[PDB]
Write a protein that binds this ligand. Structure first.
Ligand SMILES: [K+]
Ligand SMILES: [K+]
Ligand SMILES: [K+]
Ligand SMILES: [K+]
Ligand SMILES: [K+]
Ligand SMILES: [K+]
Ligand SMILES: [K+]
Ligand SMILES: [K+]
Ligand SMILES: [K+]
Ligand SMILES: [K+]
Ligand SMILES: [Mg+2]
Ligand SMILES: [Mg+2]
Ligand SMILES: [Mg+2]
Ligand SMILES: [Mg+2]
Ligand SMILES: [Mg+2]
Ligand SMILES: [Mg+2]
Ligand SMILES: [Mg+2]
Ligand SMILES: [Mg+2]
Ligand SMILES: [Mg+2]
Ligand SMILES: [Mg+2]
Ligand SMILES: [Mg+2]
Ligand SMILES: [Mg+2]
Ligand SMILES: [Mg+2]
Ligand SMILES: [Mg+2]
Ligand SMILES: [Mg+2]
Ligand SMILES: [Mg+2]
Ligand SMILES: [Mg+2]
Ligand SMILES: [Mg+2]
Ligand SMILES: [Mg+2]
Lengths: 93, 46, 62, 77, 102, 50
RNA sequence: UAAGGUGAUAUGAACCGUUAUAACCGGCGAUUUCCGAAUGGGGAAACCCAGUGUGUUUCGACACACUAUCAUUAACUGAAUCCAUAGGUUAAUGAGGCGAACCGGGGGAACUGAAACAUCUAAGUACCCCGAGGAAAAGAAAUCAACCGAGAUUCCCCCAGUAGCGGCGAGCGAACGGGGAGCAGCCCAGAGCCUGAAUCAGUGUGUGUGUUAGUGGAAGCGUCUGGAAAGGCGCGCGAUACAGGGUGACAGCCCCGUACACAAAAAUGCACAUGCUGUGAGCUCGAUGAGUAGGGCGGGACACGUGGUAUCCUGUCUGAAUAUGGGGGGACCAUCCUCCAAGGCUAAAUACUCCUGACUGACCGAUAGUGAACCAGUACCGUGAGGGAAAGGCGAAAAGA
């Protein structure tokens, strides 16, 4: 069993975009920003515990951060992990 | 025409990378010199 | 808030810790969605966790 | 290394000198030999890498006395 | 401790508003103070469309150096210097001129 | 003898300098408008310069 | 310690606080991802892959802790081989890496000079390597001296560019002795006695006194010019404070300071006082460093290039006497004088500054001064080692139109 302490840290934010929206209303899939070191197993456990929904499967990818200038002052944004969480049919969030 | 620089990341790391430098006392002296000078980049290691 | 926490036992503190972590999670979701006006709460809870963890470490004897 | 285990004799540097006194660097090596020494006390042979001089020392002081000095300096054999 | 505090009645020692009295609204970390109605500037404020747009020529107080104001001793009716002393364990400010606690 | 009171009283007066007879120097003697010597100091300076 | 504040860019957003859990500063703690000696194995640094043991389990899994090498010591075990030894396993303790200079040791150039060049010089320098410390090294006479004496080592000033050495060229270059800084002597090669007594050391407790936050800290107005006064003029005042910085112009008295006087819950340095444990001093009787000194051969270090050449070190081959003895006094012998090798330890005066604080400059002031006043060892260049810039100033205030 994954500690609840751990599960409470792994989900960071919902991800809002046209693709995320289409994923929700076509494939019953929610898109999350999750902790960089979160595994598919942890992500599944967290969503089922914290959002109280049945998860079919988690797909994940690492987004590489862009380089961005800030008044002639350059800096690289952090890489972050995105999770496409497919909910079982009948579940809603 | 074929120029002298033909990049291979594997070859780069094996020739000049951090672990190659640490492998010998002369390599470790390179790192000491570069730290002393205050280089932002000690080696080719990415 | 260190005084009143120091009275509580290890088990009570462990319970307090989970509560704070759940609050932290809830605030983080609110903040992400853009339904948190009181942004200062995020720091408050974060420092509260640190405080509890400190006291737990003291009562362990470390 | 070319070091006598008894005496500590090792290569020392110096010069060759020609008739015209041209100096070229050289080494002087010790006259080292591996020799099996009968240790009567331990009923066995011990091999040491020793100079001929070291062998004269062992004759004089006895192997037991010399082996004690080796053990004191922490030199294995 | 600071000799000039927020809410102190002060008189201006130097500058265009020399002589004028006022109350200290803010004390900045830079070592400057905003004094009510004193060191006024005419800001040419642009309209900001994001929020309400009161774009005009606004008159606001500019900070003055704290060493350019003096605590106003209403008894003497003059600028005064401040000292510190302990009364009942607590550090207090007093007017140098008449030695009265502020 | 360097009176400690006199030394402390003269410290903050920039035009005034207070020395003992042993501690006189050529530049000081010329630099100041007037030189005041105590009778004692005069005796000591005499002895110092034979 | 406090009426403000949550580091800056940086504007605002949400807030915290105002007489004491706001903040800020100091002491002691806690936390401290991954890489890196990197140490569980591996590896293209910041990653990949484990084992063991404890738990926990919703049987999906989870957490935590151990697990490098080498040295030393101990225990257990254990070949050929009968004992044994080698080897093996476990435990305990320690080490490794980094660092500007200074220090000791192992190696060790060449350009150059000699108006060529080989002896010689440069120079035991540069450089490489090993080791160590706050300093290191050296050190308590087998030393000098000169028939009088001195009395370990180190450093400074002389002696002296002398005596010497030297293709007697170029060059190299002492000591004796004097003046100073500083000063300190000990122990083993062994038993008895003494008894835990000199003494230092460890660990407590005191008392002073530093350091690591702080507190108080004097005295100015009028008038003229000016955008502004701190300037001019007038009349005052403080000064153990007229160092310095700031403030709308160049201010003792506006602000911060300064002289001066105070301050520590906590940790900590140093000097004394004193418990405790270890320590053997002192006395007596002995002992008195052998493959050593010396020698032959080959080199090296001594100012000294082997020379008439003492003394020192030793790669090689040899080889005494041992206090009735031995070393040295510049070939060597005799006499005399002086010292006692072949075991070791030792403060101070000396060297240096990556770093911290304070203060100073007939030092620089943006092509100068650091390469770098500025987000510079950066941009950029190079496979890499490595090379390596340019670039400061609106205003008093953004009042930035
Ligand atoms: K004076
Ligand atoms: K590691
Ligand atoms: K040469
Ligand atoms: K020449
Ligand atoms: K030539
Ligand atoms: K005036
Ligand atoms: K002022
Ligand atoms: K001016
Ligand atoms: K001033
Ligand atoms: K010999
Ligand atoms: Mg799938
Ligand atoms: Mg994938
Ligand atoms: Mg980043
Ligand atoms: Mg490894
Ligand atoms: Mg590892
Ligand atoms: Mg492997
Ligand atoms: Mg020449
Ligand atoms: Mg040390
Ligand atoms: Mg020493
Ligand atoms: Mg004060
Ligand atoms: Mg004052
Ligand atoms: Mg001006
Ligand atoms: Mg001799
Ligand atoms: Mg000899
Ligand atoms: Mg001879
Ligand atoms: Mg010889
Ligand atoms: Mg002789
Ligand atoms: Mg210029
Ligand atoms: Mg420059």
């Amino acid at each position: 069993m994954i500690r609840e302490e751990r599960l409470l840290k792994v989900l960071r934010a919902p991800h809002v975009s046209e693709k995320a929206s289409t994923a929700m209303e076509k494939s019953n899939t929610i898109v999350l920003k999750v902790a960089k070191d979160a595994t598919k197993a942890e992500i599944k456990a967290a969503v089922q515990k914290l959002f109280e929904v049945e998860v079919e499967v988690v797909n994940t990818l690492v987004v590489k951060g862009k380089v961005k200038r800030h008044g002639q002052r350059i800096g690289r944004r952090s890489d972050w992990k995105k999770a496409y969480v497919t909910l079982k049919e009948g579940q809603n969030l | 025409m074929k120029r002298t620089f033909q990049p291979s990341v594997l070859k780069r790391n094996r020739s000049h990378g951090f672990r190659a430098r640490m492998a010998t006392k002369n390599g470790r002296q390179v790192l000491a010199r570069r730290r002393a000078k205050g280089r932002a980049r000690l080696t080719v290691s990415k | 808030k260190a005084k009143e926490l120091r009275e509580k036992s290890v088990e009570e503190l462990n319970t307090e810790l989970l509560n704070l972590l759940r609050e932290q999670f809830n605030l983080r979701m609110q903040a992400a969605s853009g339904q948190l006006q009181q942004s200062h709460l995020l720091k408050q809870v974060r420092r509260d966790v640190a405080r509890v963890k400190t006291l737990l470490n003291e009562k362990a004897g470390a | 290394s070319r070091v006598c285990q008894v005496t500590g004799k090792r290569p020392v540097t110096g010069n060759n000198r020609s008739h015209a006194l041209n100096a070229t660097k050289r080494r002087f090596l010790p006259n080292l030999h591996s020799h099996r020494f009968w240790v009567e006390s331990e009923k066995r042979f011990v091999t040491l890498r020793v100079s001929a001089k070291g062998m004269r020392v062992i004759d004089k002081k006895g192997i037991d006395t010399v082996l004690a000095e080796l053990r004191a300096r922490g030199e294995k054999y | 401790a600071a000799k000039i505090r927020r809410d102190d009645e002060v008189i201006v020692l130097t500058g265009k508003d020399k002589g004028k009295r006022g109350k200290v609204k803010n004390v900045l970390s830079s070592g400057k103070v905003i004094v009510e109605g004193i060191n006024l500037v005419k800001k040419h404020q642009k309209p900001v469309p994001a929020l309400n747009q009161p774009g005009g020529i606004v008159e606001k107080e500019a900070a003055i150096q704290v060493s350019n104001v003096a605590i106003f001793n209403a008894a003497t009716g003059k600028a005064d210097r401040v000292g510190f002393r302990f009364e009942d364990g607590k550090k207090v400010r007093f007017f140098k001129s008449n030695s009265e606690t502020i | 003898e360097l009176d400690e009171n006199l030394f402390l009283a003269a410290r903050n007066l920039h035009k005034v300098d207070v020395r003992d007879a042993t501690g006189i120097d050529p530049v000081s003697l010329i630099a100041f408008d007037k030189v005041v010597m105590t009778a004692d100091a005069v005796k000591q300076v005499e002895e110092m310069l034979a």
